[PDB]
Design a protein around this ligand. Structure first.
Ligand code: CLA
Ligand code: CLA
Ligand code: CLA
Ligand code: CLA
Ligand code: CLA
Ligand code: CLA
Ligand code: CLA
Ligand SMILES: CC(/C=C/C=C(C)/C=C/[C@@]12O[C@]1(C)C[C@@H](O)CC2(C)C)=C\C=C\C=C(C)\C=C\C=C(C)\C=C\[C@@]12O[C@]1(C)C[C@@H](O)CC2(C)C
Ligand SMILES: CC(/C=C/C=C(C)/C=C/[C@@]12O[C@]1(C)C[C@@H](O)CC2(C)C)=C\C=C\C=C(C)\C=C\C=C(C)\C=C\[C@@]12O[C@]1(C)C[C@@H](O)CC2(C)C
Ligand SMILES: CC(/C=C/C=C(C)/C=C/[C@@]12O[C@]1(C)C[C@@H](O)CC2(C)C)=C\C=C\C=C(C)\C=C\C=C(C)\C=C\[C@@]12O[C@]1(C)C[C@@H](O)CC2(C)C
Ligand SMILES: CC1=C(/C=C/C(C)=C/C=C/C(C)=C/C=C/C=C(C)/C=C/C=C(C)/C=C/C2=C(C)CCCC2(C)C)C(C)(C)CCC1
Ligand code: SF4
Lengths: 735, 91, 85, 164, 201, 80, 30
């Protein structure tokens, strides 16, 4: 009953099971630990970062090793459009003979790989199960390096100080230039040297790379300035990927669009992209001042940025010390940027597939988009939660105020009511009218008169599609016109490739849109606005409100303030995160439902099914869920089973976890404490069991813990059931 | 399909119904606000909200046809917006 | 130091210890010349003549970079002029 | 000014006096980040010793070989692959056995480079000036060897000629 | 970089004079015990108790390897594979083309024998109050003192004799595995070569 | 044990003391209000955190404030 | 198909990465 929460003496003195539960959930909140200083905080965070990167590299190495050992990578190379990639083998003693037979792939039961790693590794120039093994070996070596570094930087003479950790200019210069630019430069080097010849049949391994010229002229044009030579003779339109037939000699080109065979971006396009990004980031990494008297001091930049007329208060004067001294502000900024970035990855890796033969891998396309959108929602909610935490525990009004006037951040708490009221107005506006139009379509179609539907053509979005060259909406605007200056300017660089790809019905590049797209985009906007409303309200109201003008004194996460003053359930800022998680899950569900139904109709060919039935709710319920759930639920029946049996089991498992979350959310404490007391009496008053007694007094889960557990069940069930549905439906419908 | 980009050619699909709704909803909001402000200066403002003063309610409701003009005659006089008597939370 | 300002124009220290000492009568015309040169270089690399692999012309490219710069030069020129420089 | 190697720069604060071989050569100011010069000197001396041994092995393998056939490769970089993995893993295990105890030793001691290796007692009876002179000799020779062994590796990777 | 100190003066390494002399074995033992208590106090890790137990197991396993070689040579060690219909799909190793290669029956029998011995060990582990030599160290008990480079030359059924023989057997197993890995033959093939041919005859 | 603080906005109306279910609060002499009394929290080890004390507080934003902290068998209300 | 030697040495290297992980884990304290 002691010594487990070593970091908290208050918990270690708890005589109940709450100590164990809270010991888990407070282990990473280093700022709240006993005998805590800032130096130890930054050093522990640094070591934890090292361990985390080691974990990531070990996970990647495991994926590589299992593809190399139990996969069919080599067979998939020779026939990427017919051979289904294998993730890893299965050894489960609970299998019957039927399950073994159904999951049997080649030599052993195995799982199909939906991560798209086969296409990614094939694109970057891997052709052998020994290339994957080398990658796994190297990644385990890197993990060992990172673990050694993490141990080393906790040693006495190697523990960095607060000044080093808060040295913003040095870290920015190095991160930008070194990390981004130099990693892009090295990736361009690999892309060219290995990937470009490997796509043309020439093997460039760790033996013949110092003697195989990536370009026939060989670094002469680069120093000579004849950089056009690297773009001459690109890959033809009859080039077979991985073979020298119809190949070229160029390494950096503009082509635009996709490879005619793999239906993916040109490797020479991506090498040029990464070279340009490398140059730009290396240049941008010299901005801030270091030991050589030139550069920028960001404190001065922030302080000097006050509009002269005066509408942002005193400007950004106090922001430098605010961000530097708070790890939650930086964490929130990083999480918001990462969420936007992974939303970008999801939205671009389906419209512009970058890996060979990934466009025809429909289950992996759906899985990748869903995975990245869910990660995006999680990251955004985390960014807002950490902003709220910064408000609660790191924000100092004195730093952000100069002689009564407030800086740009402190002024966000002055018109907080205006911000929240207008977020509420936008949410109500969008919800009222999107639901009104959807229900109008529902009722009108149900009454057998679909012509009375309200169908709004998304002209604004179709205008953008025409601006990028789509000649489908008869707009003749910028790139849909051959005479506009936008078209004449790039008529010789990348329009022929771009136009040939955007004006193609088999791509996902700028999918044609209609009224259903309009309505679902408005639903998405409503979801985004409502999630933002909850999170922003929790962040701004974190330090106090009218119901609790001292909420900052109770911390970020506390159960309530009691039944007084009318009742104060879910009044903390943590509860705002807890409520906004449901809205994030709902919004990501809407986004992924829209994406998956649109792409299922596109792949099956019945795009008229979406364009007609997507305007009313029953259309969704009947033609997406009810229609495509048939292959999934018949993964095992009283007659047999298929390789989709695991997905049906996961479907039911997700439903069960969802409803257990419903348990933990609807039923609150107090009802579970008295029942536990009855159980305690029963155990204490029964023979043959009195010999065994608990060391920690069994008590009901706390209010905040119960909310967390219900949210965890809700989210896990949500994710599992939707993953099972999307994967099984795609597999069982599209062969 | 409804063309709601703003062009007057298809103006009867969205723009004219938009104007009609804006008029009606502004009427409703104006009469509600006028009734709230009128019975807010009586002895028992809360009583007159569950038990409506039907004479005064009828008087105000039929006066909402000038809500666009009344709104841009009360905003000019500064009687439409409060300034600093509005309450604010602790931070 | 103290780049923070509340008057009509920021102090000349915000321009760095290279632009803080340029007379406004030098920065102004220099900014206008740089803007004109950059606009012409952009309109000669593109717009007037369509771009091609064989026609990149580092002068026009480097030139075009004077347009973004021009913005900074005339901002500094105004700052110097308002600070009696 | 205070740098002997770069007579024009002033050396950094941590480059002074003791720690023989101190010629004020730290233009990039790397010593400003390390808490002390103990670990960096240990690493430099380990590199110096490994590079001396590497240069000696390079030349000897150029001219002298073991009686067996597996050691008949003249090119050291080609011998890196021709030699059986058993010999190389034995060498690596020996080095790691030497390295783990010194791993415990280096991160905490005042003289991490002092491994207590003096079987012939070349330092017993030597005065402080003579000991410092020996340390300077070792550091010089090691730096020259490091440059030389890197040059040999580069010229073998670029021309295939392992020597001259 | 220059205007500040990367490492604070208050956080600096101090040389541990408590390990002066203290040959690498004593230093390693002390470092392990200080760094990992509550597993060192149990006798686990680089400890004399663990060394003695592992030596006993290595000697018994040299006996077991000899017995396995004899059984393989003398027509024992049943033939074929396990019945998947009888023992489920967990005994299936691979399916090449329409035939299920299962775990060899000989491997199953050897695993059952090893299970017998391991069960005996587990019983002795959860029988601490009735066994002569316990598996772990009692709280308070102190680990027998390391024997050193060369244990005392005391012939017979002595602690030093068992210690020396356990070290020899463990080194023999290490050498056997190293020879098998380096050369590439089976473990039993290496034992057969190292016995002249008198085992697999 | 939870933390209970009393603030000088206390009007000495005793409603907090007579609402405490575990006898944590008591009325002590004072000279900052008309009643000449102020609430005190000398037995916070018995505080259970039910916050009945501040449900009976008539002052604007409370004069008795309960800050939940470390848990104890007394503060958890455990009869077992 | 990878050999037994390839998998075995990868397992051995994985063990070394495990001992480095517990050293980091124990250094981040109990
Ligand atoms: C060149 C030198 C260099 C390099 C390579 C690094 C590299 C790193 N440092 Mg680091 N650091 C440096 C110098 C350097 N540092 C210096 C000088 C200091 C002292 C001032 C620090 C202080 C420091 C601290 C205190 C910490 C790090 C950490 C890290 C790691 C970050 C985690 C990671 O793996 O990210 C990998 C990231 C990438 C490979 C790139 C990310 C790609 C992004 C997401 C895509 C963005 C593209 C685009 C913009 C998207 C938007 C679209 C656009 C249209 C807008 C990383 C390994 C952290 C860590 O984990 O420590 C172990 C940490 O806590 N460093
Ligand atoms: C007035 C002096 C002067 C001038 C005008 C040049 C001009 C040039 N040098 Mg050069 N050079 C000079 C002095 C000069 N050098 C001196 C003093 C040395 C050292 C003694 C060199 C060493 C040198 C090398 C080693 C190389 C050049 C090259 C080049 C050409 C490549 C330029 C290019 O496309 O950028 C290329 C742009 C980038 C690399 C990045 C931007 C260019 C004509 C290159 C060449 O092949 O010329 C034909 C080349 O490889 N120079
Ligand atoms: C790199 C990103 C990052 C980082 C560094 C942190 C770091 C931190 N967060 Mg944070 N957070 C993040 C992302 C991040 N978070 C995101 C994305 C969200 C939104 C979901 C949040 C939401 C959040 C909240 C709401 C809170 C924190 C808190 C904290 C602090 C303490 C964490 C703690 O106690 O962990 C405790 C760890 C756990 C309780 C483990 C939970 C594990 C979950 C339930 C998943 C495990 C189930 C698993 C999937 C099983 C699968 C089931 C199977 C059947 C399939 C710490 C500073 C807390 C704090 O006090 O901050 C000051 C706090 O209240 N964060
Ligand atoms: C289908 C279920 C459902 C529906 C319809 C809503 C509807 C709403 N929620 Mg909501 N919510 C739900 C489930 C649901 N929620 C769940 C399960 C949770 C998790 C606890 C939340 C958590 C939550 C939070 C935390 C917040 C909302 C908010 C809102 C409002 C957003 C503005 C809007 O759309 O106005 C339009 C309203 C509708 C379309 C629905 C009512 C209209 C009916 C049909 C009129 C019929 C008249 C006869 C709206 C009233 C936000 C809010 O109050 O914004 C102002 C807010 O802050 N909800
Ligand atoms: C009739 C008077 C009236 C007026 C002038 C307003 C005006 C406003 N409300 Mg509002 N509101 C009202 C009644 C009114 N409300 C009532 C009765 C409710 C309870 C359901 C709300 C609930 C409400 C919410 C939840 C929100 C607003 C918001 C707003 C603002 C933006 C407009 C909007 O979103 O409409 C909202 C309108 C509704 C949700 C529907 C109102 C219900 C009916 C139509 C109004 C009642 C008519 C009344 C009985 C007429 C009697 C008068 C007669 C006796 C003479 C704006 C200041 C939003 C805001 O703060 O943005 C700045 C916001 O988030 N209001
Ligand atoms: C220590 C000083 C030194 C000396 C005397 C030489 C001497 C020589 N080098 Mg050399 N070299 C050195 C350092 C040195 N190098 C270093 C530090 C590098 C970079 C790591 C190189 C890289 C290098 C290359 C790449 C080549 C030589 C070549 C040569 C030969 C002409 C000549 C024998 C050339 C030669 O003939 O190779 C056999 C040749 O191609 N060297
Ligand atoms: C799984 C493999 C395995 C095998 C083959 C053995 C084999 C053996 N163990 Mg053993 N043991 C094992 C795992 C194993 N152990 C584990 C994992 C533990 C820790 C719980 C132990 C703990 C243990 C103890 C405590 C004892 C043994 C004993 C024995 C011996 C009993 C044979 C006998 O009666 O000879 C005739 C034999 C050497 C006993 C012994 O020393 O030999 C009699 C004994 O006292 N073992
Ligand atoms: C080996 C060496 C010193 C070895 C000393 C040892 C082991 C001493 C060990 C001991 O003292 C201790 C530690 C402790 C004592 O109690 C015991 C002993 C055992 C006695 C120095 C080498 C020092 C080696 C040096 C300085 C080498 C310099 C090399 C140069 C300049 C080469 C240049 C070229 O190779 C290139 C670059 C390119 C080629 O093509 C052309 C040429 C010209 C050939
Ligand atoms: C070689 C070895 C350890 C070598 C350790 C070394 C060099 C350590 C060196 C260091 O510490 C120093 C000096 C100083 C430190 O600062 C640094 C390092 C470098 C760390 C252990 C072998 C250890 C070998 C062991 C433990 C062998 C155990 C064998 C057993 C138990 C037998 C089992 C069987 O009987 C069964 C169970 C069933 C039968 O069928 C099969 C068999 C296998 C026969
Ligand atoms: C001790 C041993 C076996 C002991 C067995 C015992 C006690 C059995 C006891 C029994 O009760 C049981 C358990 C069960 C009963 O039913 C049977 C009996 C019999 C009653 C095997 C050692 C086996 C020991 C072996 C195989 C040793 C191999 C050593 C090698 C190869 C050494 C090589 C080197 O020496 C060189 C060549 C050069 C050096 O410089 C380097 C190195 C590498 C050190
Ligand atoms: C709470 C809080 C927080 C947080 C916050 C957040 C989380 C936010 C988010 C945010 C976000 C998330 C934002 C976003 C943004 C975005 C943007 C801003 C965008 C932009 C874009 C653009 C501008 C584009 C443009 C264009 C177009 C459109 C076309 C193409 C081309 C171009 C480019 C021109 C913090 C921590 C900080 C602090 C405290 C408070
Ligand atoms: S919680 Fe409020 S009421 Fe319950 S005891 Fe402590 S003070 Fe008295």
């Amino acid at each position: 009953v002691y010594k487990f929460p070593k970091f908290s003496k208050a918990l270690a003195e708890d005589p109940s099971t709450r100590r164990i539960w809270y010991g888990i959930a407070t282990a990473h909140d280093f700022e709240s630990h006993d005998a805590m200083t800032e130096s130890k905080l930054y050093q522990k965070i640094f070591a934890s970062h090292f361990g985390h990167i080691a974990i990531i590299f070990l996970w990647t190495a495991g994926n590589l090793f299992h593809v190399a050992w139990q996969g069919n990578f080599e067979a998939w190379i020779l026939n990427p459009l017919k051979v289904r990639p294998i993730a890893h083998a299965i050894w489960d003693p609970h299998f019957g003979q039927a399950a073994y037979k159904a999951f049997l792939k080649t030599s052993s039961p195995a799982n199909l790989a939906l991560s798209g790693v086969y296409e990614w590794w094939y694109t970057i120039g891997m052709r052998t199960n020994n290339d994957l093994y080398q990658g796994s070996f190297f990644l385990i070596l890197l993990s060992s390096l990172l673990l050694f570094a993490g141990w080393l930087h906790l040693q006495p003479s190697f523990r960095p100080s607060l000044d080093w950790f808060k040295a913003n200019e040095y870290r920015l210069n190095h991160h930008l230039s070194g990390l981004f630019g130099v990693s892009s430069l090295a990736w361009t080097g690999h892309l060219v040297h290995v990937a470009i010849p490997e796509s043309r049949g020439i093997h460039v391994g760790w033996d013949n790379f110092l003697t195989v010229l990536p370009h026939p002229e060989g670094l002469t044009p680069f120093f000579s300035g004849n950089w056009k030579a690297y773009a001459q003779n690109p890959d033809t339109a009859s080039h077979i990927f991985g073979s020298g037939e119809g190949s070229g000699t160029a390494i950096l080109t503009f082509l635009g669009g996709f490879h005619p065979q793999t239906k993916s971006l040109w490797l020479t396009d991506m090498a040029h992209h990464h070279l340009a990004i490398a140059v730009l980031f290396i240049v941008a990494g010299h901005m801030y001042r270091t030991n050589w008297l030139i550069g920028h001091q960001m404190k001065l930049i922030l302080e000097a940025h006050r509009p002269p007329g005066g509408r942002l208060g005193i400007g950004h004067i106090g922001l430098y010390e605010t961000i530097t001294n708070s790890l939650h502000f930086q964490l929130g900024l990083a999480l918001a940027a990462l969420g936007v970035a992974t939303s970008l990855t999801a939205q671009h890796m389906y419209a512009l597939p970058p890996y060979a033969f990934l466009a025809s891998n429909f289950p992996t396309q759906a899985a990748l988009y869903t995975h990245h959108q869910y990660i995006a929602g999680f990251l955004m909610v985390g960014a807002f939660a950490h902003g709220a935490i910064f408000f609660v525990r790191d924000y100092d009004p004195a730093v952000n105020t100069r002689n009564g006037e407030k800086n740009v951040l402190a002024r966000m708490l002055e018109h907080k009511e205006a911000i929240i009221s207008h977020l509420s107005w936008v949410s109500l506006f969008l919800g009222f009218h999107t639901l009104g139009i959807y229900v109008h379509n529902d009722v009108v179609v149900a009454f057998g008169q679909p012509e009375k539907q309200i169908l709004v053509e998304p002209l604004f979005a179709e205008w953008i599609q025409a601006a990028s060259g789509k000649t489908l909406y008869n707009f003749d605007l910028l790139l849909a016109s051959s005479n506009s200056p936008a078209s004449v300017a790039s008529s010789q660089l990348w329009l022929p490739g771009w136009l040939s790809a955007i004006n193609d019905g088999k791509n996902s590049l700028f999918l044609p849109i209609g009224p259903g797209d309009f309505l679902v985009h408005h639903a998405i906007a409503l979801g985004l606005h409502t999630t933002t409303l909850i999170l922003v309200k929790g962040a701004l109201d974190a330090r106090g409100s009218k119901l609790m003008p001292d909420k900052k004194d109770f911390g970020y996460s506390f159960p309530c303030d009691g039944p007084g003053r009318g009742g104060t359930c879910d009044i903390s800022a943590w509860d705002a995160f807890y409520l906004a998680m449901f809205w994030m899950l709902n919004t990501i569900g809407w986004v992924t439902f829209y994406w998956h139904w649109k792409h299922l109709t596109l792949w099956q060919g019945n795009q008229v099914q979406f364009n007609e039935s997507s305007n009313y709710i029953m259309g969704w319920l009947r033609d997406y869920l009810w229609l495509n759930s048939s292959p999934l639920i018949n993964g095992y029946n009283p007659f047999g089973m298929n390789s989709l049996s695991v997905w049906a089991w996961m479907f039911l498992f997700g439903h069960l976890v969802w409803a257990t979350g419903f348990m933990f959310l609807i039923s609150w404490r107090g009802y579970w404490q008295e029942l536990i007391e009855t159980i305690v009496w029963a155990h204490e008053r029964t023979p043959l069991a009195n010999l065994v007694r608990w060391k920690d007094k069994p008590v009901a889960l706390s209010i905040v813990q119960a909310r967390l557990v219900g949210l965890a069940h809700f989210t896990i069930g949500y994710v599992l059931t939707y993953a099972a549905f999307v994967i099984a439906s795609t597999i069982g419908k599209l062969g | 399909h409804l063309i709601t980009d703003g062009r007057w050619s298809h103006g009867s699909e969205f723009l004219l119904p938009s104007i009609l709704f804006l008029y009606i909803s502004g009427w409703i909001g104006w009469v509600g606000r006028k009734y709230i402000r009128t019975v807010g200066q009586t002895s028992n403002p809360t009583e007159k909200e569950i038990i409506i003063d039907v004479p005064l309610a009828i008087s105000i409701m039929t006066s909402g046809f000038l809500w666009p003009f009344a709104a841009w005659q009360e905003f000019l006089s500064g009687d439409l917006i409060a300034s600093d008597e509005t309450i604010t939370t602790s931070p | 130091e103290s780049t923070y300002w509340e008057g009509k124009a920021p102090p000349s220290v915000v321009l760095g210890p290279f632009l803080s000492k340029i007379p406004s009568g030098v920065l102004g015309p220099a900014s206008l010349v740089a803007l004109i040169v950059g606009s012409y270089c952009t309109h000669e690399s593109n717009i007037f003549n369509t771009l091609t692999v064989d026609t990149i012309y580092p002068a026009y490219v480097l030139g075009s970079f004077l347009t973004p710069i021009s913005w900074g030069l005339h901002v500094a020129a105004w700052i110097q002029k308002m600070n009696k420089a | 000014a205070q740098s002997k190697a770069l007579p024009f720069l002033k050396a950094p604060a941590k480059l002074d006096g003791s720690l023989a071989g101190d010629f004020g050569f730290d233009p990039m100011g790397i010593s400003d980040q390390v808490a002390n010069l103990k670990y960096v000197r240990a690493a430099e001396l380990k590199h110096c010793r490994v590079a001396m041994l590497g240069f000696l092995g390079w030349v000897v393998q150029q001219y002298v070989h073991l009686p067996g056939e597996i050691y008949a490769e003249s090119n050291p970089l080609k011998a890196l692959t021709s030699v059986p993995l058993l010999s190389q893993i034995q060498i690596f295990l020996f080095i790691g056995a030497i390295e783990l105890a010194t791993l415990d030793q280096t991160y905490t001691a005042d003289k991490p480079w002092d491994l207590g290796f003096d079987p012939l007692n070349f330092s017993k009876g030597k005065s402080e000036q003579q000991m410092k002179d020996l340390e300077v000799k070792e550091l010089k020779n090691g730096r020259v060897a490091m440059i030389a062994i890197m040059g040999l590796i580069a010229q073998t990777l670029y021309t295939g000629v392992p020597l001259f | 970089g220059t205007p500040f100190d990367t490492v604070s003066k208050d956080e600096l390494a101090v040389e541990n004079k408590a390990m002066a002399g203290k040959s690498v074995f004593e230093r390693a033992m002390a470092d392990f015990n200080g760094r990992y208590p509550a597993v060192a106090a149990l006798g686990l890790g680089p400890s004399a108790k663990a060394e003695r137990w592992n030596g006993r197991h290595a000697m018994f396993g040299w006996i077991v390897l000899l017995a396995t070689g004899y059984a393989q040579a003398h027509g024992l060690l049943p033939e074929g594979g396990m019945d998947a219909k009888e023992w489920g799909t967990w005994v299936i190793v691979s399916t090449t083309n329409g035939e299920q290669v299962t775990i060899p029956a000989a491997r199953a029998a050897i695993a059952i024998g090893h299970l017998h011995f391991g069960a005996v060990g587990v019983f002795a582990a959860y029988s601490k109050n009735s066994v002569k030599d316990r598996l772990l160290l009692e709280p308070g008990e102190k680990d027998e003192a390391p024997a050193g480079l060369f244990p005392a030359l005391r012939p017979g059924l002595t602690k030093e004799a068992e210690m020396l023989n356990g070290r020899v057997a463990m080194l023999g197993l290490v050498a056997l595995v190293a020879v098998s890995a380096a050369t590439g033959q089976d473990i039993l093939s290496v034992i057969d070569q190292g016995l002249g041919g008198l085992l697999l005859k | 044990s939870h933390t209970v603080k009393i603030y000088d906005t206390c009007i000495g109306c005793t409603q907090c003391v007579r609402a405490c279910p575990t006898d944590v609060l008591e009325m002590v002499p004072w000279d900052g209000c008309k009643a000449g009394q102020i609430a005190s929290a000398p037995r916070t080890e018995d505080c259970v955190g039910c916050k009945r004390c501040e449900t009976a507080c008539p002052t604007d934003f409370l004069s008795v404030r309960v800050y939940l902290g470390g848990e104890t068998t007394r503060s958890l209300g455990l009869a077992y | 198909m990878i050999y037994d030697s390839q998998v075995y040495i990868a397992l051995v290297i994985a063990v070394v990465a495990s001992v480095l992980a517990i050293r980091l884990g124990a250094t981040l304290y109990n």
